Amino acid sequence: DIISVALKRHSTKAFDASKKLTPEQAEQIKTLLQYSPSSTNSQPWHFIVASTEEGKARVAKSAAGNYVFNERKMLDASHVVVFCAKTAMDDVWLKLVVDQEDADGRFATPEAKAANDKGRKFFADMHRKDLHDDAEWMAKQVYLNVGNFLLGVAALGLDAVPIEGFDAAILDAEFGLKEKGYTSLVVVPVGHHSVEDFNATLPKSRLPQNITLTEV
Amino acid sequence: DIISVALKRHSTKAFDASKKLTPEQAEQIKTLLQYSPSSTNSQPWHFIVASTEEGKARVAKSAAGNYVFNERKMLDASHVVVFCAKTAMDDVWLKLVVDQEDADGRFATPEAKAANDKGRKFFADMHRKDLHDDAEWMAKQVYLNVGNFLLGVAALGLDAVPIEGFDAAILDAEFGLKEKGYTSLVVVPVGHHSVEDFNATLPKSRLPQNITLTEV
Ligand SMILES: Cc1cc2nc3c(=O)[nH]c(=O)nc-3n(C[C@H](O)[C@H](O)[C@H](O)COP(=O)(O)O)c2cc1C
Ligand SMILES: Cc1cc2nc3c(=O)[nH]c(=O)nc-3n(C[C@H](O)[C@H](O)[C@H](O)COP(=O)(O)O)c2cc1C
Numbered sequence: 001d002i003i004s005v006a007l008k009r010h011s012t013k014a015f016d017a018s019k020k021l022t023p024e025q026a027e028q029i030k031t032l033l034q035y036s037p038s039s040t041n042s043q044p045w046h047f048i049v050a051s052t053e054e055g056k057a058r059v060a061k062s063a064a065g066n067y068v069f070n071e072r073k074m075l076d077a078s079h080v081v082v083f084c085a086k087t088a089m090d091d092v093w094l095k096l097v098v099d100q101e102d103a104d105g106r107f108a109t110p111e112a113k114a115a116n117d118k119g120r121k122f123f124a125d126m127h128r129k130d131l132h133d134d135a136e137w138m139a140k141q142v143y144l145n146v147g148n149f150l151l152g153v154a155a156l157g158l159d160a161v162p163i164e165g166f167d168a169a170i171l172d173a174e175f176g177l178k179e180k181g182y183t184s185l186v187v188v189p190v191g192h193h194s195v196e197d198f199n200a201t202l203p204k205s206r207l208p209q210n211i212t213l214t215e216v
Numbered sequence: 217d218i219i220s221v222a223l224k225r226h227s228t229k230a231f232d233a234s235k236k237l238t239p240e241q242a243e244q245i246k247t248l249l250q251y252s253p254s255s256t257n258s259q260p261w262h263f264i265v266a267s268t269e270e271g272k273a274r275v276a277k278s279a280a281g282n283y284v285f286n287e288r289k290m291l292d293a294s295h296v297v298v299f300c301a302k303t304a305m306d307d308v309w310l311k312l313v314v315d316q317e318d319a320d321g322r323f324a325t326p327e328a329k330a331a332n333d334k335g336r337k338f339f340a341d342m343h344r345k346d347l348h349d350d351a352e353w354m355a356k357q358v359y360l361n362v363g364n365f366l367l368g369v370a371a372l373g374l375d376a377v378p379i380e381g382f383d384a385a386i387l388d389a390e391f392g393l394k395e396k397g398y399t400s401l402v403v404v405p406v407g408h409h410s411v412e413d414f415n416a417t418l419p420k421s422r423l424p425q426n427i428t429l430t431e432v
Binding site: 002003006007011028030031032033034035036037039041043045046047048049050051052054055058096097100101103104105106123136139140141143144145146147148149150151152155156162164165175202203204205206207208209211212213214215216 | 218219222223227244246247248249250251252253255257259261262263264265266267268270271274312313316317319320321322339352355356357359360361362363364365366367368371372378380381391418419420421422423424425427428429430431432
């Protein structure tokens with residue numbers, strides 16, 4: 001039951017470095033990242049999946065500064081996912097997306113494909129041209145991917161923690177992201193908690209629905 | 217299996233108005249909204265859940281004008297969730313959150329509670345004082361809730377569609393949201409698809425991992 005998964009998952013504070021994802025789970029987490037929904041199927045994202053000691057150490061340099069409490073989590077987890085957003089929405093990317101929708105068989109006609117593209121360009125143009133907020137818009141889609149991911153990995157039986165406490169400038173510099181048209185937003189270590197994970201045995205806490213929720 | 221759910225879920229384009237959530241499912245979707253993670257457990261959100269004909273019609277007013285293709289989804293679904301973000305992060309809210317964490321039993325000591333609050337205020341202040349991006353930050357947390365929600369409701373056996381194609385100004389005006397300190401971001405109708413849902417039988421399309429995903 002998915003509600004059980006939602007009530008029992010927790011942000012892991014310490015990982016067991018000896019406990020790896022199975023090779024199958026390593027495929028499955030990639031499936032989760034790929035198949036997340038996004039506004040217009042824009043998919044304005046890149047993922048770095050660090051599973052080696054060298055890879056994880058490159059990521060963990062971003063947990064300099066006031067972010068040392070997060071450094072261990074990045075080193076000790078099995079797999080570490082960096083969620084990145086595109087920095088700008090370009091026409092090359094929009095063509096890639098609609099051509100993929102076509103290859104996958106989503107259009108009965110050429111007309112239907114043209115209309116999909118006109119629809120997507122119109123909607124994207126609203127963000128880059130009029131509102132000038134396309135970076136924020138694309139970032140939101142990435143956070144949506146994260147949310148999907150966290151419940152997904154919980155449902156697979158894996159521990160994880162979302163991390164905003166890192167220096168994106170360091171991480172971007174380390175993987176040359178700016179030059180490739182991306183910026184890091186969230187880091188998610190995935191694995192199995194250790195005995196040092198104090199949050200594993202703490203009760204979960206949320207505001208009551210009588211504050212956060214209205215029915216009409 | 218959650219990977220099946222991820223591969224088979226789809227944005228519903230048409231709902232069957234005669235098919236309601238069971239009383240139990242109506243509680244479960246609320247549990248999903250409530251128990252989503254958020255940066256610092258800040259929970260900077262409000263949900264409107266419209267299940268009556270009057271309520272759903274009020275929401276659907278936001279889809280008149282240029283967004284008519286989305287209007288019928290909001291009218292015909294069983295339950296329609298409006299995801300709202302806070303417009304500003306205030307100290308009253310931060311106190312509410314940490315006091316709830318305390319009531320739920322997450323602190324062994326007064327010291328531990330003080331440290332949690334200092335930690336959260338420090339991190340929040342970084343967004344409101346420096347950066348001046350706390351609206352964007354809070355909105356991202358809400359999108360993360362959406363991502364969690366969409367996989368959740370799919371895993372419960374329910375159909376849904378995320379909607380950004382609505383007029384937030386109209387929706388905010390209709391529920392007096394600005395005055396209460398919120399803004400609408402995403403509308404999610406939940407229910408069961410009708411035979412008019414052309415997207416139910418279309419193959420899913422994603423960009424290949426050799427573009428979106430790097431391993432290290
Ligand atoms: C976007 C985001 C950023 C977070 N950043 C961190 C972080 O840097 N360090 C950390 O220990 N936890 C981090 N958390 C975990 C949250 O504090 C956590 O989800 C919240 O306290 C509720 O805990 P739960 O995940 O156990 O339900 C983050 C959560 C989210 C959603
Ligand atoms: C944030 C967001 C906004 C969306 N807005 C709309 C919308 O206004 N109308 C609509 O029909 N679908 C909307 N969609 C659905 C997307 O087109 C869809 O997720 C994408 O094509 C992938 O297909 P799938 O959701 O069936 O996996 C939205 C999706 C998301 C995540």
